[PDB]
Amino acid sequence: DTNPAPKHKSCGDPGPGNDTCGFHSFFNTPYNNFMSYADDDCTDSFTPNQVARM
Amino acid sequence: AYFSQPMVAAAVIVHLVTDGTYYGDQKQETISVQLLDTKDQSHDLGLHVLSCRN
Q: Nearest residue on chain B to A15, judged by CA atoms?
A: B41
List the beta bridge partners of residue B49.
B30
Query: Distance between CA atoms of A7 and A52, rounded to whole angstroms?
Result: 24
* A4 half-sphere exposure, CB direction, 13 A CA radius: 7
Q: How many CB atoms lie within 10 A of CB A26?
A: 16
> Min CA distance, A17 vs chain B (Å)?
8
Distances (CA, A) of A12 to A16, A26, B3, B36: 13, 11, 31, 26
Residue A37's DSSP bridge partners are none
- Which technique was the structure solved with, according to the deposited record? cryo-EM
Give me the sign of the Cα torsion angle A46, A53, A49, A21.
positive
The three-class DSSP label of residue A44 is coil
A-B Cβ pairs (cutoff 8 Å, strict): 7
How far away is chain B from the Cα of A42, in angstroms, using its nearest Cα? 29
Q: Calculate ∠ Cα A50-A7-A3, nearest 5°.
A: 40
Determine the distance in angstroms separating the CA of B37 from the nearest CA of chain A, rounded to an integer.
Answer: 13
Contacts of A21 in chain B (CB under 8 A): none
**The residue type at A1:** D
